[PDB]
Design an enzyme around this catalytic site. Structure first.
Site, PDB file in Angstrom:
ATOM      1  N   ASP C  14       0.940  -1.146   0.065  1.00 12.71           N
ATOM      2  CA  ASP C  14      -0.043   0.023  -0.153  1.00 12.71           C
ATOM      3  C   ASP C  14       1.141   1.252   0.110  1.00 12.71           C
ATOM      4  O   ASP C  14       1.317   1.647   0.941  1.00 12.71           O
ATOM      5  CB  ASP C  14      -1.127  -0.092   1.015  1.00 12.71           C
ATOM      6  CG  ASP C  14      -1.521   1.315   1.372  1.00 12.71           C
ATOM      7  OD1 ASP C  14      -2.145   2.204   0.616  1.00 12.71           O
ATOM      8  OD2 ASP C  14      -1.329   1.920   2.675  1.00 12.71           O
ATOM      9  N   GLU C 177      -7.308   1.550  -4.453  1.00  9.96           N
ATOM     10  CA  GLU C 177      -7.555   1.375  -2.976  1.00  9.96           C
ATOM     11  C   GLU C 177      -8.967   1.128  -2.471  1.00  9.96           C
ATOM     12  O   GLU C 177      -8.785   0.326  -1.581  1.00  9.96           O
ATOM     13  CB  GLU C 177      -7.108   2.831  -2.162  1.00  9.96           C
ATOM     14  CG  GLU C 177      -5.664   3.168  -2.767  1.00  9.96           C
ATOM     15  CD  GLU C 177      -5.003   4.090  -1.763  1.00  9.96           C
ATOM     16  OE1 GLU C 177      -5.432   4.450  -0.630  1.00  9.96           O
ATOM     17  OE2 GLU C 177      -3.594   4.139  -1.860  1.00  9.96           O
ATOM     18  N   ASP C 199     -13.175   6.480   3.151  1.00  6.42           N
ATOM     19  CA  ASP C 199     -11.753   6.424   3.689  1.00  6.42           C
ATOM     20  C   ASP C 199     -11.355   8.084   4.364  1.00  6.42           C
ATOM     21  O   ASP C 199     -11.165   8.685   3.675  1.00  6.42           O
ATOM     22  CB  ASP C 199     -10.884   6.336   2.524  1.00  6.42           C
ATOM     23  CG  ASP C 199      -9.517   6.003   2.801  1.00  6.42           C
ATOM     24  OD1 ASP C 199      -8.931   7.066   3.319  1.00  6.42           O
ATOM     25  OD2 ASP C 199      -8.782   5.227   2.118  1.00  6.42           O
TER      26      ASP C 199
END
Lengths: 7, 159, 594, 161
Positions: C14, C177, C199
């Site tokens: 990530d 993501e 998020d």
């Protein structure tokens, strides 16, 4: 009649 | 002739699939056993840390309990400030202990428990049940529910 | 083309603007790997020193003050963008380091007279994270799956792929993501749905509306707030705390540096504590030292105060989400699932806002801080090699074992053991002269004989006489194929074997896995205590039997009236108020010497 | 179709044989990595507890420093006993700290190392070699070579002249 356990 | 190839291939394929499944199950069980071993090592390290950590808290609490509460006045600013700072410090210590599984044992009036309490002395006390902690001489501690240090208690006897 | 024959380990990285996370497929579940300092998340900071160095991570952050013009941070806002761009022109002014233009008219950086592309800084970060993965793995991590924000265009995705390639990683794919978060939450194997990925907590707020039609993820819309993150909540809490301290005492902690760091850490812990607890306390002894004496900070902070401090910041996440739903052409009823990503989403106020905004209680079953990396690891495990084969490998629901003389539950096969597994253990006879051995098979998780279940039972008949403990019986479980358990008892040395093919090997597939182990953890220390009690009872009984047998062997000129400690041992036996009898097991005196 | 089916099945057999070989390699690698992880968890694993108690240790040190030490007298006996208890607590926490590998970092004049030190300022200082640590604002800790808390230092800068 009950099984034992090895130490 | 050519039909023997089918039987040989089928037998070999079944044997190989059995062996491959058993080998793919061996690694998973080994992984779980390794995880258990690592968890045991972590638990042992934390327990050995806490066992010698207990003395620091004991010394600090004894020091801050020795001072009588009638002398924490405004005409002794240095004693009052030190007392406040030190009681805040032991509150911080106990909060850190609680966050990481270490819990105190102060069984004031609780029923006796051989797995958590140690009978320092036996003496009858009026107004209290027999086999009950009348006075705790030393505080105990628990780590994840298992007694890291038994409390030194006083057990009421029969008069 | 045919199968690429990856045959290796695929890491999932990530790559974030502020903090990066790496995870691997550890069988059936993803594991987030900790770096060389034991932290699971590595800052995306790179720095170069006077002669030459490549400090990446926290080493670069610590040195940032001494080298401010050569410490590159938040370069992921420069990737894939030309030099003459609006956002790049806003960013160049604030950044202490130098941003130059390349030959291709791209926004590069400069460090001691050397040119680095914004993909090369990410390549250095990826090199550090690949080293982190290799340290845990033990071998080289050649393949990788790198996540990008859903608003990246093809140029920035290609830049990320090139950055991965520079680090010596075979980038299998560049994933989103939101898609990584959906994979981590487990929505890959779900019917057609529209999901919203919330998020909040990083350096940015992002809301992406996804569709899982046909089994693949499509990004219907994307939105968010660029200048809203998890640092603003902590800053608001810290400002409130220092304002309260100045009001109560009269000293501003902003001038102080050590005190400000202490208060910042205390505010972070207090914010993390006001997600499961209504109230929290902030204790900071000896915060500041004055001519009048030290000052100790003592504040009581409740959840209502905290959610009133940051109400504006949370409210700043309602317009972007409504606009994202407008772009996706969906309504509240059209959203089939809500996904929480980011560390700031653990507060019940943020989740309440999300529920009031999407009409659905958010999914919070996965650690939001490490969901993108875990989903990238899942996608990498799916893409290459064979991980689904371990996914279809059925495991035992509950632990299995046999009986024991003192009623103990001897565990041969534990709970989460893959089915095609054979394990064997050797056991002795119960008492001297015993010829019949009975095996009691039972399943459960408690450390007791009949407190769990009873699957089956058989008997091993026929054993040559021998002193107790000498005969060896090899009880072996032969769980094979998928399901049934082939328990077999083997009398080592002789014949007269036994077997059983007991059924119901997890046939009652229900929530017993969730509930039987739920109350087996609460009732564990007491169960351990009683098991230790019965073990001590068995040991003391064996010792007293040995002592009695030895005493009945030698009788002449034996004044063993002092050897009657077995009376005290028996008195202790009839007492259910002691910890254990191991300490009083010192009754093996053999002064007679046979 | 018989011959091609047999060839395809033999190819699948060879593929699953290679899969079995890969599984054996994977379990060997897992054994090695597990033996590594157990040692790693024996060394560390009190990292969170130590990082939580660092602030207690610093507060005890600050308490020792804060008392003016002119009031430690027999005239004020209760402030003296409290001070001795605090001193004993500080030495006890530092003795249990170094028993479990937690070592204090106090680089008074060492070179700046951006792996255990967090630079707070870059103020130039005369008479000191450039790049060294001028002063340590807060002492750092590390256990078994893992820098738990960096030493918040101040590095010196070359003279502008």
């Amino acid at each position: 009649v009950l099984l034992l356990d090895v130490t | 002739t050519l039909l023997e190839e089918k039987v040989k291939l089928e037998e070999q394929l079944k044997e190989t699939v059995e062996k491959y499944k058993r080998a793919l199950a061996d690694t998973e069980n080994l992984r779980q056993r390794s995880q258990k071993l690592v968890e045991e090592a972590k638990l042992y390290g934390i327990q050995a840390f806490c066992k010698d950590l207990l003395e620091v808290a004991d010394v600090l609490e004894k020091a801050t309990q020795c001072v009588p509460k009638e002398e924490i006045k405004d005409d002794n600013p240095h004693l009052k400030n030190l007392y406040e700072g030190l009681v805040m410090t032991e509150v911080q210590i106990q909060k850190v202990f609680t966050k990481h599984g270490l819990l105190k044992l102060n069984p004031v009036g609780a029923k006796f428990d051989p797995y958590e309490h140690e009978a320092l002395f036996h003496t009858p006390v009026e107004g209290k049940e027999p086999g009950t902690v009348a006075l705790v001489s030393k505080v105990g501690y628990k780590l994840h529910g298992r007694t890291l240090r038994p409390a030194l208690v006083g057990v009421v006897k029969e008069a | 083309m045919a199968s690429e024959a990856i045959k290796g380990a695929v890491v999932g990285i990530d790559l974030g603007t502020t903090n990066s996370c790496v995870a691997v497929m550890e069988g059936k579940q993803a594991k987030v790997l900790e770096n060389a300092e034991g932290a699971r998340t590595t800052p995306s900071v790179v720095a170069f020193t006077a002669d030459g160095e490549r400090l990446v991570g926290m080493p670069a952050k610590r040195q940032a003050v001494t080298n401010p013009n050569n410490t590159f941070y938040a370069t992921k806002r420069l990737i894939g963008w030309r030099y003459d761009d609006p956002e790049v022109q806003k960013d160049i002014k604030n950044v202490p380091f130098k941003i130059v233009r390349a030959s291709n008219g791209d926004a590069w950086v400069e460090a001691h007279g050397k040119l680095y592309s914004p993909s090369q800084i990410g390549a250095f970060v990826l090199m550090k994270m690949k080293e982190t993965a290799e340290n845990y793995l033990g071998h080289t991590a050649k393949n990788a799956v790198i996540t990008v924000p859903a608003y990246f265009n093809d140029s920035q995705r290609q830049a990320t792929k090139d950055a991965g390639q520079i680090s010596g990683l075979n980038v299998l794919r560049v994933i989103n993501e939101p898609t990584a978060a959906a994979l981590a939450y487990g929505l890959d194997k779900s019917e057609d749905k529209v999901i919203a990925v919330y998020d909040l907590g990083g350096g940015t707020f992002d809301i992406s509306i996804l569709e899982i039609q046909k089994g693949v993820f499509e990004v219907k819309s994307t939105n968010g707030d660029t200048f809203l993150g998890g640092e603003d909540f902590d800053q608001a809490l810290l400002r409130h705390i220092v304002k309260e301290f100045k009001r109560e005492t009269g000293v501003d902690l902003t001038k102080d540096n050590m005190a400000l760091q202490r208060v910042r850490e205390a505010a972070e812990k207090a914010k993390c504590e006001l997600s499961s607890s209504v109230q929290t306390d902030i204790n900071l002894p000896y915060l500041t030292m004055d001519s009048s004496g030290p000052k100790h900070l003592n504040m009581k902070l409740t959840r209502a105060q905290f959610e009133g401090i940051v109400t504006d910041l949370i409210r700043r996440t309602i317009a972007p989400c409504q606009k994202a739903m407008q772009d996706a052409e969906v309504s509240k009823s059209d959203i089939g699932e809500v996904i929480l990503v980011g560390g700031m989403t653990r507060m019940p106020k943020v989740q309440q806002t999300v529920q009031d905004l999407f009409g659905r209680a958010p999914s919070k079953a996965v650690n939001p801080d490490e969901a993108v990396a875990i989903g990238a690891a899942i996608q990498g495990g799916v893409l290459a090699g064979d991980v689904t084969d371990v996914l279809l490998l059925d495991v035992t629901p509950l632990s299995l074992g046999i009986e024991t003389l003192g009623g103990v539950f001897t565990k041969l096969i534990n709970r989460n053991t893959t089915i095609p597994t054979k394990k064997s253990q050797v056991f002795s006879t119960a008492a001297d002269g015993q010829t019949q051995v009975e095996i009691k098979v039972c399943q459960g998780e408690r450390e007791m004989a009949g407190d769990n279940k009873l699957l089956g039972q058989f008997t091993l008949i026929g054993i040559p006489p021998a002193p107790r403990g000498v005969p060896q019986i090899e009880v072996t479980f032969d769980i094979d194929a998928n399901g049934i358990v082939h328990v077999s008892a083997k009398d080592k040395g002789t014949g007269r074997e036994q077997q059983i093919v007991i059924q119901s090997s997890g046939g009652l597939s229900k929530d017993d896995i969730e509930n039987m182990v739920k109350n087996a953890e609460k009732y564990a220390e007491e169960d351990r205590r009683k098991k230790e009690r019965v073990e001590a009872v068995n040991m003391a009984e064996g010792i007293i039997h040995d002592t009695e047998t030895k005493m009945e062997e030698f009788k002449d000129q034996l004044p063993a009236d002092e050897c009657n400690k077995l009376k005290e041992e028996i008195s202790k036996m009839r007492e259910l108020l002691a910890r254990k009898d191991s300490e009083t097991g010192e009754n093996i005196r053999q002064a007679a010497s046979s």
